[PDB]
Amino acid sequence: KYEELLKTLENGINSEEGEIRLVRKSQGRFKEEFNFDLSLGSKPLLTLKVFLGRKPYWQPWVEVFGVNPNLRNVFFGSEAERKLYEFLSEHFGRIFVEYFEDKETTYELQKGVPPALSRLGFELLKLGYTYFRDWFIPEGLMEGGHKIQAEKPKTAEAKARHLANLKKEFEEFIGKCEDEGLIKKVKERYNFLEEEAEERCRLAAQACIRACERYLALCTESSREQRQHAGDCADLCRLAALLLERRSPWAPAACELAARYALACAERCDGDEPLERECAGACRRFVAACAPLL
Amino acid sequence: KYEELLKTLENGINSEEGEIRLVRKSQGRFKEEFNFDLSLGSKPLLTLKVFLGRKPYWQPWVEVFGVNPNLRNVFFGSEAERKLYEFLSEHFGRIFVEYFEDKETTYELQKGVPPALSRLGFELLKLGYTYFRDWFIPEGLMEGGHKIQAEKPKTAEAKARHLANLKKEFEEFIGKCEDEGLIKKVKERYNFLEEEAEERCRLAAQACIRACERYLALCTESSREQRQHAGDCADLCRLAALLLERRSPWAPAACELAARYALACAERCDGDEPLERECAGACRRFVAACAPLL
Amino acid sequence: KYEELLKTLENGINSEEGEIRLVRKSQGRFKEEFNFDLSLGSKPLLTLKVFLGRKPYWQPWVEVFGVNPNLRNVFFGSEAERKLYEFLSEHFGRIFVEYFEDKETTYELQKGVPPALSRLGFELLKLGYTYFRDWFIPEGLMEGGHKIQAEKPKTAEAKARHLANLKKEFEEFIGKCEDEGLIKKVKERYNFLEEEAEERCRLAAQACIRACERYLALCTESSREQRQHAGDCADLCRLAALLLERRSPWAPAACELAARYALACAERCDGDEPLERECAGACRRFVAACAPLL
Amino acid sequence: KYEELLKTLENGINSEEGEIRLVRKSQGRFKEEFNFDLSLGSKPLLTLKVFLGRKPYWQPWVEVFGVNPNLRNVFFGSEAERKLYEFLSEHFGRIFVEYFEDKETTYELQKGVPPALSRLGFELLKLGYTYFRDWFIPEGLMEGGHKIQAEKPKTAEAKARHLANLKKEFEEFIGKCEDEGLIKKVKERYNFLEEEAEERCRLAAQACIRACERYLALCTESSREQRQHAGDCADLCRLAALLLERRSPWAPAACELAARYALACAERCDGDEPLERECAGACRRFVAACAPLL
């Protein structure tokens, strides 16, 4: 698990704003601490303190620290930002990000926005992190007291547990803030993610419709229960995907009936055959896309 | 109203099993009682005690009594049976039918079947009668001791009110009877009516789709909530009606979500306008068609 | 069934406004028609056309007709009114009452009040009649075209079916009428009956509490399940009866939990013993009082 | 925070089975790791690896490891067990306990019992720990392969969140295990905690009754809806608390109606005022106590 990250790091990470590569990597204060200085274009950018985990007391995590204030108006909001979080989310359940040098997020946080909805948090939100803790106080034994803790949900219970919690913080924030040009920049980000979750469902449904369409067509060896299961399942994902595309308010009520028959289509149509496997898989995907709506 | 019946009776009623004509007609015990002896082929068949009504204390009704036991294996289940009830349903809200000489229905009733689902009741069920009362007890108080009372529904509310009531009696009967060749002969009769019940829903949904289709189109004066309410409502009735036509097993699950939004479409789209009134009415109809499935 | 009524009629019916007795009784136009002229104090008051029933086509009913207009401001609203309906409700499912000579009810009906809520209907409402039909048109074959039809509910399903229907007519009437001194005289009658139904429950609960109180006390031979069943049952009827007395809005929600345990107390505590029989009976009563709230 | 524990450890911890004292204490692999060998009576018993916390990446925790298998039938279930967990719960949010040498718990865990309900877990459950993770797998990745993770709840929301989760695991376990002398040993342990859970509800209800009693009394500035909301709410918590004290079987049915009106009392009575805040808070508490029963 240690060299999967260190291979894609010495490899280098491509961006329009300069490629990153390791400048100085070291094994940290303890057996499991590691300290990686990195470089963006020509310049030394930031230091990465990482953790593979040391079971059972320790979770695995990554901290990003000591960033380059010269690169403050270039980096944040770029391809480079988006790609670096996508990289780290593949190996780290928790992530710690210094917002000391980010002028937008510091400002935003302090204006009272929920940490997930901040400019910088909004991006980590998108990469599967749901839990958030904002440190502005260094609280004794921590140096560099301006960091965001973010965590991927433990369960599917916790992921919709937190999202509900975030919505209440969003409703509360909106009935507190008087800054109306900030309040929009968060409303649009809040809504836009609501929209992205629907569009994933819309595409999951699309590929499920075709995966069923081909199933009933070309799998002639199939029970009549299976031709009905997949047949109806396709018409459902249809109606749902229609309501998603029009961001209809009745759509999550639709997706709920589709998902329970989608999982029912999967369980009766799956098999060794690849057309069967794709029907089931595309049923499971669509099902997996609807949890943010339910 | 008196001579519309007596003209089609002296005219005679054609059947493959003999034509019926009046043999002896008389004006009964009271001003409004009438007693008609009838003949099938050569033989005197039965007596008809009829009532044009004597408002406001009296409903209009017909009793059939004193039937010919020689014609017991010829009549019941023929063209002749079907046509005689179709005739009477055109003038009589209530109908009283002696099942003393019918060996199949007596037997069936006794075996515990709901009166509507009996061999003989099943036919009166088809001719628009919904309410049923089975008299088997001439217990020291009652003359005319083996007769079925049947009645046409007062409202569209009562017709789906009763059909729901019948379904519960059908579910209860099915979890009580051990006679498995009777239990099928009722399931199949119930089934055919389930099939009639789906097609009513399918057509109710059809006329609802168009009633919404025209609403959003030609009622330009309508809120954007109303254009979404009726717009989505149509797509629902669509998916449902698809599953009904293919007698799909997932269809009642579909109709359930449609009905709850169909009643929601009605309440937000109804008004003085006829296009509004038809949207609501066609929403209510579809809703009224789905009660036999839920 | 014929002489139970005719014995309490030749006996005479006591009132503060004069005693009624039969003046001329006769057997009517048909075998089952009967026509009874009656007398209040010295004077001939009204004629009663009655019906014991002639199964299975006929329900049993009583019509009151040809009343004394001199007794118009004396009778209506007296002890005499209340007692005469209480008498007739013991033998007649349906009742027909001429409102031609009643100046208050004619007026009220026409002002658009629901027939049950009229001055005269309100009293028949109290005596277990729920269904109502108001004849102002004589519709051909009826002489004296100013009569109220009233009927006792067929089931417990129909009694709360109709009461719900009446409430909607009451809400609709209240959003239509501009006569504000009539509108109160109906609001107070509507509310007052809501109140009387609660008070019956309150007293049914009271006698149930004591019937349980004595049970657990003096029936020492009783299971510990039974001492808990009746013990808890008493505490429930307590909390309920508290909320009823304060006409609390949360009371019907309370009565609902009490009733389901009241019927549970009955079924486990009943027996041959009279203290057992009274516990069960008082449990059933309380249960029977809560149906108007549920 | 470091020497509060190390002062009560060098002091020594008294038990009927021998007093514990530190034999060899050392500062561990990192700045914040500490490794304490301890002694029970004459013998070296176990090693304690502790953590004061190193914010913000680190929670504070204690691991117990390398225990004495000779002391296996003496310790577990004694005064000594109970007291050691009570000590540690005062400084540690999380606790890691090796169950390698405990024959009862290993066995029990394996038999499929939820970790909290095990012999050893049941005790840590009592000391305010709610979350549980059972490590049995040192599968080629993990050192320290037979240890129980246990954690104190973050909120009052999480504590009844988890207890509900445990109940479902208890219901699931009970419908899976065929070992009937184990299944009782867990039912009885679960039962005692059910009994603790009712008494919490009883006291939550008590403090809620008084919090409402004072509200309606001394908050004279209050709507008449609020005086009814809190007034009735108190009478409910009354009836419930009565049934809890008698461990009545109808009590959870009672608590269910109370809780839904308790949360309704809170939402309409809460405010800036402390008497308002205590009414709402005591309503929420009672509500929070009833989740283990529902």
* CA distances for D196 relative to C135, D202, D290, angstroms: 67, 10, 12
How many domains does chain B fold into?
Answer: 2
Nearest residue on chain C to D252, alpha-carbon basis: C257
Q: How far does chain B reach from its first CA to its final CA, in angstroms?
A: 40
The domain that contains B41 carries what CATH number? 3.40.630.30
Q: B59 vs A115, B115, B151, C58, C67, CA distance in Å?
A: 74, 22, 11, 10, 26
User: At what angle are helices D180-218 and D251-269 packed, to 10 degrees?
Assistant: 40
In B, minimum Cα distance to A249 occurs at: B228
- What is the chain B residue with the closest CA to C29? B30
Q: Name the helix (H) or strand (E) containing D64.
A: strand D61-65
**Cα–Cα distance between A281 and A266 in angstroms, integer?**
7
Distance CA B215, CA B225 (A): 13
Q: Output the CA angle D202-D208-D210, nearest 5 degrees.
A: 110
Exposure of D36 by Cβ count < 10 A (0-12 exposed, 13-18 middle, 19+ buried)? Answer: buried
Chain D residue numbers with beta carbons less than 8 Å from the beta carbon of C235 are 239, 242-243
* Cβ atoms within 10 Å, residue B160: 19
Cα dihedral across residues A135, A136, A138, A139: positive or negative: negative
Task: Round to whole Å and give the CA distance between C105 and C119.
Answer: 6
The residues with which C44 forms a beta bridge, in sequence order, are C39
Note whether D29 contacts A29, CB cutoff 8 Å. Answer: no
CA-to-CA dists, residue C223 to C209, C230, C276, C279, angstroms? 19, 11, 12, 15
How far apart CA A46 and CA D85 sit, in angstroms, is: 44
Do the beta carbons of residue C134 and residue C193 sit within 8 Å?
A: no
Q: Which of B29, B57, B61 sits opposite C57 (nearest CB)?
A: B61
* Angle, helices D224-245/D251-269, rounded to nearest 10 degrees: 150
The angstrom resolution of this structure is 4.2
Nearest Cα to Cα of residue B93 among B30, B51, B37: B51
Cross-chain residue pair D236–C238, CB shorter than 8 Å: no
Q: Which residues of D38-48 are buried (b: 16+ CB within 10 A; e: fewer)?
A: bbbeeeebbbb
The CA dihedral of C233, C235, C240, C243, to the nearest 10 degrees, is: 180
Please indicate, yes or no, if residue A218 is contained in any of the structural domains. yes
**Cβ-contact C127, C121 below 8 angstroms:** no
Query: Which of chain D's residues have a Cβ under 8 Å away from the Cβ of C254?
Result: 257
How many C-beta atoms lie closer than 10 Å to residue A123's C-beta?
Answer: 19
Last residue of a domain, one of A122, A154, A187: A187
CA angle C145, C148, C150 (to 5 degrees): 145
C-alpha C243/C-alpha D236 separation (Å) is 10
CA-based torsion, C170, C173, C174, C179: positive or negative: negative
Longest dimension (CA), chain B: 71
Token pair, residue D35, equals: 């490794």
Q: B62 has which bridge partners?
A: B50, B95
Rounded distance between C-alpha atoms, residue A177 and residue B75, angstroms: 83
Of the candidates B265, B201, D257, the one whose C-alpha atom is nearest the C-alpha of residue A248 is: B265
Tokens of B207: 């006329």
User: Among positive and negative, which fits the CA dihedral A211, A213, A214, A215?
Assistant: positive
Host H or E run for residue A120? helix A119-126
Residue after which a domain boundary falls, among D109, D136, D152: D152
Number of helices and strands (H, E) in chain B?
A: 10, 7
- Is residue D168, in this structure, part of any structural domain at all? no
How far apart, in whole angstroms, are the C-alpha atoms of residue D243 and residue D236? 11
Question: Cβ B239–A236 below 8 Å, yes or no?
Answer: yes
Check contact C-B (3+ Cβ pairs < 8 Å): yes
The 3-state DSSP class for residue D49 equals strand
What 3-state class would DSSP assign to C235?
helix
Phi, psi of C34 (to 5 degrees): -140, 140
Both C129 and C31 in a single domain?
Answer: yes
Q: Which residue of C has its CA nearest to D265?
A: C250
Chains C and D touch (3+ CB pairs under 8 A): yes
Burial of B119 (0-12, 13-18, 19+ CB in 10 A): buried
What 3-state DSSP class applies to C98?
strand
Q: Per the CB < 8 Å rule, is A243 touching B261?
A: no
Residue to test with chain B: of A229, A257, A261, most B Cβ within 10 A: A257
In the sheet where D34-40 sits, what is the strand order? Answer: D20-27, D34-40, D43-51, D61-65, D94-98, D147-151, D131-135
SS3 B148: strand
Looking at chain A, the number of H-run helices and the number of E-run strands are: 10, 7
What is the least distance, in Å, from the CA of A178 to any CA of chain D?
22
How many other C-beta atoms are found inside a 10 Å radius of the C-beta of residue B155?
8
Query: What residues pair up with A50 in beta bridges, in sequence order?
Result: A34, A62
The burial class, CB within 10 Å (0-12 / 13-18 / 19+), for A37 is middle
Domain final position from A187, A211, A244:
A187
Question: By CB neighbour count within 10 A (0-12 exposed, 13-18 middle, 19+ buried), where does C7 fall?
Answer: exposed
In DSSP terms, which residues pair with D26 in a beta bridge?
Answer: D35
- On whether residue D32 sits in a domain, the answer given is yes
Nearest to D277 by CA among D261, D289, D264, D266: D266
Would the CB atoms of B144 and C31 count as touching at under 8 Å? no
Tokens linked to B16: 């493959």
How many Å apart are CA A186 and CA A202, to the nearest integer? Answer: 24
Residue with tokens 């409502």: B233
Residue D44 sits in the same domain as residue D97? yes
Do C59 and C135 lie in one domain? The reply is yes
**Gap between the Cα atoms of B102 and B109, Å rounded:** 11
- Compute the distance between CA of residue A211 and CA of residue A286 in angstroms, rounded to an integer: 11
Residues in a beta bridge with D96: D63, D149
Beta strands of chain B (E only): which ranges? 20-27, 34-40, 43-51, 61-65, 94-98, 131-135, 147-151
Query: Are C148 and C16 contained in the same domain?
Result: yes
Token pair 């050569």 in the structure block, residue: B42
- Which residues, in sequence order, are bridge partners of residue C25? C36
Supply A121's token pair: 């948090």
The answer as to whether D39 is a domain residue is: yes
Do B136 and B38 fall into the same domain?
yes
> Distance from B154 to chain C by nearest Cα, in Å?
14
Q: Per the structure block, which two tokens stand in for D110?
A: 């394996």
Of B29, B54, B96, nearest to C57 by CB-CB distance is B96
* A139 and A232 inside one domain: no
How far apart are alpha carbons D192 and C63 in whole angstroms?
69
Taking CB atoms and an 8 Å limit, are B254 and A254 in contact across chains?
no
Residue with tokens 């479902």: D168
Contacts of D31 in chain A (CB under 8 A): 29
Asked if residue A47 belongs to a domain, the reply is yes
- Do C13 and C19 contact (CB within 8 A), yes or no? yes
Chain A contact residues (CB < 8 Å to D): 29-31, 33, 55-57, 61, 63, 96, 133, 135, 139-142, 147, 149
CB of A278 within 8 A of CB of A211?
yes
- What's the rounded Cα separation, in Å, for the pair B265 and B240? 16
Name the CA radius of gyration of chain B, rounded: 23
Q: Nearest CA to B225 among B274, B269, B170, B290?
A: B269
Q: Are D160 and D288 in contact (CB under 8 A)?
A: yes
Cα diameter, chain D? 71
The CA–CA distances, whole Å, from C176 to A148, C118, C172, D82 equal: 62, 16, 6, 74
C191/C185 Cα distance (integer angstroms): 10
The closest alpha carbon to A147, from A77, A63, A222, belongs to: A63
* Residues spanned by the domain of D88: 3-152
* Beta carbons of B63 and B48 less than 8 angstroms apart: yes
Burial A9-31 (b: 16+ CB within 10 A, else e): beeebebeebebeeeeeeeeeee
Query: C57: which chain B residues are within 8 Å (Cβ-Cβ)?
Result: 51, 61, 63, 96
Whether residue C29 lies inside any domain: the answer is yes
Q: Which tokens belong to B174?
A: 């099915």
User: Is C294 part of any domain?
Assistant: no
Nearest Cα to Cα of residue C240 among C269, C187, C283:
C283
What distances in angstroms separate CA D172 from CA A177, B15, D167, one per listed residue? 47, 67, 8
| CATH number, residue C217 | 1.20.1270.360
Residue C108 tokens, joined: 């009220």
Within this chain, do residues A285 and A168 fall inside the same structural domain, yes or no? no
| C-alpha to C-alpha distance for A256 and A286, rounded to whole angstroms | 11
Q: What is the C-alpha separation between B206 and B234, in angstroms, rounded?
A: 9
Question: Contact at 8 Å (CB) between C254 and C240?
Answer: yes
Cβ proximity of A96 and A147 under 8 Å? yes
CA angle at C85 for the pair C79 and C90, rounded to the nearest 5° = 130
Cis before B56? omega within 30: yes
Distance from CA of D244 to the nearest CA of C (A): 11
> Across-strand partners of C88?
none
Pair of tokens at residue D236 = 């409910």
The alpha carbon of C278 is separated from its chain's Cα centroid by a whole number of angstroms, namely: 24
Q: Is the peptide bond before D56 cis (omega within 30 degrees of 0)?
A: yes
**C contacts of B54 (beta carbons < 8 Å):** 141-142
**Cα separation, D88 vs D91, whole angstroms:** 6
Asked if C250 and D261 touch (Cβ cutoff 8 Å), the reply is: yes
Asked whether residue D112 falls in the same domain as residue D217, the answer is no
- Phi-psi region at C53: left, alpha or beta (left = phi > 0; alpha = psi -120 to 50): left
Cβ separation of B235 and A228 shorter than 8 Å?
no
CB B116 within 8 A of CB B53: no
| Subunits adjacent to chain B (3 or more Cβ pairs under 8 Å) | A, C
> A140 vs D96: CB contact, 8 Å cut-off?
no
Q: Which chains does chain D touch, 3 or more C-beta pairs < 8 A? A: A, C
**Consecutive H or E run containing D25:** strand D20-27
Inside any domain, residue A294: no
Q: Name the neighbours of A, counting chains with at least 3 Cβ pairs within 8 A.
A: B, D
Give C56's contacts in chain B (Cβ within 8 Å).
96, 133, 135, 142, 144, 147, 149
Of C292, C290, C293, the closest CA to residue C203 belongs to: C290
Q: Are residues D189 and D268 in the same domain?
A: yes
CB contact under 8 A, A139 and D56: yes
- CB count within 10 Å of CB D32 equals 18
Longest distance between any two alpha carbons in chain A, whole Å: 69
Extended beta strands in C142-203, E state:
147-151
The rounded distance, in Å, linking the Cα atoms of B294 and B256 is: 7
What one-character DSSP code corresponds to residue C167? H
User: Residue B57 is nearest to which of C29, C30, C96, comparing CB atoms?
Assistant: C96
Q: Which of B1, B2, B57 to mutate to test the interface with C (most CBs of C within 10 A)?
A: B57
- Look up residue A271 and give its amino acid: G
In a shared domain, residues B12 and B140: yes
Query: D239, C239: Cβ pair inside 8 Å?
Result: yes
Q: How far apart are CA A48 and CA C159, in angstroms?
A: 76
Instruction: Tell the residue number behind the tokens 């925070």, with chain if given.
Output: D1
Which residue(s) pair with C40 in the sheet?
C20, C43
| Pair A123, A12 in one domain | yes
A142: nearest CA in chain D? D55
Is the CA virtual torsion B179, B181, B186, B190 positive or negative? positive
Least CB–CB distance from A29: residue in D30, D53, D56: D30
Closest CA to C294 of C268, C267, C260: C260
Residue A261 and residue A203 share a domain: yes
